Structures are given as structure tokens and as C-alpha cells.
């Protein structure tokens, strides 16, 4: 016998590569709404149905934290947000001296709203008209050089002029499918209860992911896909306290949130052909913005997350605790329900300590025990900590109500010489990346790399 090279095209072999993926919609938005829906106008109208191909005897080395595709989501998000703001009204003329008083004096539930008035430039450049609006105290700051008077300004005039978000734009988290371009493929695990790193034993190709909602939030996730069979705990490295812990849930705890007081919207003309929108009045009662969770189901979830998290810290008792301190954007859970940017105090929610007994203290009888959170609202948001990314959200008339399944908790550990029997887990001020990474952990992209060469014992015709 003797052996001769043969060249084979089309053979199935592959390599890791970084490549620009492209976004594919469910096409439902592609009426007028394609250009109204933030996180859809960049994407193809498609039926991107995830394909059927379990790969058989393959084993593949996935990774959740070293992954690149999360940074493609992050750059695509920022570049699309910033694109959608360019045509909209800059608030530059509105950096005037505001003169203010309280809406009805009294408790913080109503004194949250300042009533403020100012001169506005009409269409007629030489004429200014006196005008008024209601503002939430976080949007406002006292003007200095004065004896503690009624003189105020918008919070942002010393940093950047925000655009009003165009009122046709809708921030609703319509799902994105991410797709591989031609000559690349996406692999996923089917081997659930996966650990975020190491070999995955049951693997499929798909050209496009399932529908991923681009939900931004902190301290909790919302409308995330649930884990398959059990609570899954993931971290880049638990032994470094600086690593986040994604506590991915098996079962949906449910949250309800509301601004129950009844706002009305007024439009203020500013120069030729632009309207600022402001809260004109509160109709009837002043009752506070708040969120409700069934404290029974939440308490079972803090037992079960106690049980699982103890496997990595065996025998030790678990303290939950509040966040350590800072701005609202760091210390409070956050949303965009209806189009309003809530900021809810989680301090009473992550309360108490629970231990290796993990008894079913919730009895099988009926109970209506609700935990409730106090929530601030803001209109000026310095989005994703960008001073130039900032926007003013126009107010929404009527009263907001909003319901959701919840989370994969973004915890951080806190522990040292104090510990002995016990350690503290606190809500964490997550990056945007951490949300999306709790959906994309399943997925890896490869370059197909055909043109294989092998010995076959055959010889050319001459």
C-alpha cells in the first residue's frame, strides 16, 4: 500500500471567531411601529424560527463571561438609542430661571411635585409668554447667588442639553433574535443546568437565537426566561467578592407597580414648530407611587435561593441585606413601566437572615401578606451614565399600572473576618451587560472552516 493526499470541500469543521451578528425581528412591529419601537428599527422583518439540529456525538467548550456577543448587544443598543434621539427637540431654550413653590405644601407624597413658572419664547422671537408646569424634585435644583429663595433650574443645564424623547418612540422591550451571517453558525447548549463555563454535552446549531427582550433594569431582572428544572447560580469567580452572582430563578415571582395619582399632560410651544410636554395638573387624589410583591412567595424564594447558595458556602447561615449606599441609580431597583422611569427602594425587600434548616414557614392556608416598596419617579435621565446620552421623558396622562414576572437576582457578596457562621448578600448595581448575559450564556458563535485534506490511497487519472 501507499497513501496520497485528497482534497475535500464542504467538510464540517469550525473555529471561534468575532464577527458582527445581525438582528432579526418577529416582524409584528413592521406596520408604522418599526421606526417607533426602540430596539427594532435597526432589524430585519423576519420569521427567524430557531433550527432543529442536535449535533449528536459533539462536546463543546462554551463560556458566559469571556463571551464577545454581549458587547455586540451593548454597542448595538447604545448606537441605536443615540440614533433615535437625533431628530428630537433639544431643551436648550428651557434653561431659564424657574420660579417655584410647593404644589400644596404638606408631606413628601405631594411635596414631591414643585409648581414652577417661567418666561417661554413664543414663535414670535421678540415675545416671551409667562408659563407654568409641575416638576418632580429630583429634576430640579436651587439656583445659587440668592438668599434661599424660590429660584431654581433644571438639573442638567450645567452639563448638557437633553433632547425630549420624540413622543412617537416606544421603549417597549420587543424581542430581538440575534442571527449569524452566512459562513458562520451559532451553537447553543441543550444540556441545561449548565455552569457558565466548561464542556457542554448536548449541543445544537441554530442560525438565530430565541427572542431576547432588551430589558434594562438593576437589582432585579424582569421578563427573563426561567431556568429549566432548578435555581441556577452563576458567577465569573465566587472567591473574589467583586464578582456578581446571577441567581437565575426556576419559578416566576410576580411584581405589580403603579403611579396611582392621575396626571394630565400639557404642551408648551417653544420657537417655531416644537412642543415641550409637561405635567399640568393632578386630578383629585395625591396617593403615592408604589410596587407590590406577595411576601409569601418572595419568602419561599429567599429560602430556596438560601439552600442553593449555601452549597458554595456550606454549613454557613445567609444574610440578605440592603444595598450599601449611593444615588437612586445605584441604590434602587429601576424600570420603564408605561414609559415612566421608576426608582424603587428595595431596602425592606432584602431583609432578614436564613439558615440551613430552611423550613416551610409559610403555612398551606391562605394569606394576603404583601410587601410594598416606596418608589420615586424622574423625568430627566442621564441614560447608562452618559451625560451626552441624557433625555427628558415626556409625562403620560392618566395613571400607570404595570405587571411582570421577575428576575435572576443580581447579588454581590459581602464578607470577611466578621463571617464565621455567616455572610451577607446585597443587591448589586449591575451593568446593562449583566441583564443580556443572563440570556446569552447559552450561545457561542463559530466560523465554519471547510477545505479539509486527508489520505485515501488514490491517484490522479494521469
Amino acid at each position: 500500500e501507499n497513501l496520497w493526499v485528497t482534497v475535500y470541500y464542504g467538510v464540517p469543521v469550525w473555529k471561534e471567531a468575532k464577527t458582527t451578528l445581525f438582528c432579526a425581528s418577529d416582524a409584528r412591529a413592521y406596520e408604522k411601529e418599526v421606526h417607533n419601537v426602540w430596539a427594532t428599527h435597526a432589524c430585519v422583518p423576519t420569521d427567524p424560527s430557531p433550527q432543529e439540529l442536535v449535533l449528536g456525538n459533539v462536546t463543546e467548550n462554551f463560556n458566559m463571561w469571556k463571551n464577545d456577543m454581549v458587547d455586540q448587544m451593548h454597542e448595538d443598543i447604545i448606537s441605536l438609542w443615540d440614533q433615535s434621539l437625533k431628530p428630537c427637540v433639544k431643551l436648550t431654550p428651557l434653561c431659564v430661571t424657574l420660579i417655584c413653590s410647593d404644589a400644596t405644601v404638606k408631606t413628601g407624597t405631594v411635596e414631591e411635585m414643585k409648581n414652577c413658572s417661567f418666561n417661554t419664547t413664543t414663535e414670535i422671537r421678540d415675545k416671551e409668554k409667562k408659563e407654568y408646569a409641575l416638576f418632580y424634585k429630583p429634576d430640579i435644583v436651587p439656583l445659587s447667588e440668592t438668599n434661599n429663595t424660590s429660584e431654581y433650574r433644571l438639573i442638567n443645564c450645567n452639563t448638557s442639553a437633553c433632547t425630549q424623547a420624540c413622543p412617537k418612540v416606544t421603549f417597549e422591550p420587543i424581542p430581538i433574535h440575534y442571527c449569524a451571517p452566512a459562513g458562520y453558525a451559532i451553537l447553543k447548549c441543550n444540556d441545561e443546568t449548565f455552569n457558565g463555563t466548561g464542556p457542554c454535552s448536548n449541543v445544537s446549531t441554530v442560525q438565530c437565537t430565541h427572542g431576547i427582550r432588551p430589558v434594562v433594569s438593576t437589582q432585579l431582572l424582569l421578563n427573563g426566561s426561567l431556568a429549566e428544572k432548578e435555581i441556577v447560580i452563576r458567577s465569573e469567580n465566587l472567591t473574589n467578592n467583586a464578582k456578581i452572582i446571577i441567581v437565575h430563578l426556576h419559578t416566576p415571582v410576580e411584581i405589580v407597580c403603579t403611579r396611582p395619582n392621575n396626571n394630565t399632560r400639557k404642551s408648551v410651544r417653544i420657537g417655531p414648530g416644537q412642543t415641550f410636554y409637561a405635567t399640568g395638573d393632578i386630578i383629585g387624589d395625591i396617593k403615592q407611587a408604589h410596587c407590590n410583591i406577595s411576601e409569601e412567595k418572595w419568602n419561599d424564594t429567599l429560602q430556596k435561593v438560601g439552600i442553593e447558595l449555601q452549597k458554595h458556602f456550606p454549613n454557613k447561615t445567609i444574610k440578605y441585606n440592603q444595598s450599601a449606599g449611593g444615588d437612586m441609580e445605584i441604590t434602587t431597583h429601576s424600570f420603564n413601566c408605561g414609559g415612566e422611569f421608576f426608582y424603587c427602594n428595595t431596602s425592606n425587600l432584602f431583609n432578614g437572615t436564613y439558615n440551613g434548616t430552611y423550613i416551610s414557614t409559610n403555612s398551606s392556608a391562605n394569606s394576603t401578606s404583601t410587601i410594598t416598596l416606596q418608589c420615586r419617579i424622574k423625568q430627566i435621565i442621564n441614560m447608562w451614565q452618559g451625560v451626552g446620552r441624557c433625555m427628558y421623558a415626556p409625562p403620560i396622562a392618566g395613571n400607570i399600572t404595570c405587571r411582570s414576572n421577575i428576575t435572576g437576582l443580581l447579588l454581590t457578596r459581602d464578607g470577611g473576618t466578621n463571617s464565621n457562621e455567616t455572610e451577607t448578600f446585597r443587591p448589586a448595581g449591575g451593568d446593562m451587560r449583566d441583564n443580556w448575559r443572563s440570556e446569552l450564556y447559552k450561545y457561542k458563535v463559530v466560523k465554519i472552516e471547510p477545505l479539509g485534506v486527508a489520505p485515501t490511497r488514490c491517484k490522479r487519472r494521469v
Partner: protein
């Protein structure tokens, strides 16, 4: 796993089968290598790389022989230092992805041999056609 309608239409779907059994599916990969504001530049750049990837492969296949044949013999003997397996391990035991871990060493030696085999053959055929 394997079905000739779709196995390589999401690419890759035969890769567990061992090298001899995979060789009946190659067409499904080949026919799938070429499917289809700043996002306009993203799609154009993605498309144009997928074309150049395909043409640079078809050009290498042209220059070595064979011009479009998916499978062909080459008149380059298989060197003793590469010969570390009996043929039946290659065709009947290994997967294509596993075999790549071996022959991903020293590959461009084979491409240099393959190119020059074709030069000498075209020189020889040209004299036969000159007599003919």
C-alpha cells in the same frame, strides 16, 4: 441529527458521524456557504466578506486541482511524519473536527506541494497537446 434536506442548512449537523460517513453530506454545506443608516454598512460589510471567503476557497481549489469537484485525488504522496495512523482509524474512527486537530499542524506544506503538482502537470499536458 443528520438529514440531507437541512443538516448543513443550519450548517455543521453531521460533525459527530466519523469521516467516512460524513463524506456523503458535503453538498449541503457547499450550497449553504452563500445564503442571504449605519446598519446598511454592517450588512454590506458582512455580505462582502462572505463572498470573498467563498471565492478565495474556489480559487485554491482551481489552482491545485480540482476546479469544482468536491472530492479529488492529487498526486502528492503522504509523508511518513504525517502517517501516524492506519487508514481505518481516519475513515472509520475519527470525526472531521478531531482529525483537524492533527493536520492543523504543517498545513501550508501540503498546499505548497499541491500547487506545484499542478504546474508540472500543465507543463506536461502542454507538450502532449503540442505533439497532438
Amino acid at each position: 441529527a443528520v438529514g440531507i434536506g437541512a443538516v448543513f442548512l443550519g450548517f455543521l449537523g453531521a460533525a459527530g458521524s466519523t469521516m467516512g460517513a460524513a463524506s456523503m453530506t458535503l453538498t449541503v454545506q457547499a450550497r449553504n456557504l452563500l445564503s442571504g443608516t449605519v446598519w446598511g454598512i454592517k450588512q454590506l460589510q458582512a455580505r462582502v466578506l462572505a463572498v470573498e471567503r467563498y471565492l478565495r476557497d474556489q480559487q485554491l481549489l482551481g489552482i491545485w486541482g480540482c476546479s469544482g469537484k468536491l472530492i479529488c485525488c492529487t498526486n502528492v504522496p503522504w509523508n511518513s511524519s504525517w502517517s501516524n495512523r492506519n487508514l481505518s482509524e481516519i475513515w472509520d474512527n475519527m470525526t472531521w473536527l478531531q482529525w483537524d486537530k492533527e493536520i492543523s499542524n504543517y498545513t501550508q506544506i501540503i498546499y505548497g506541494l499541491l500547487e506545484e503538482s499542478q504546474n508540472q502537470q500543465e507543463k506536461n499536458e502542454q507538450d502532449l497537446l503540442a505533439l497532438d
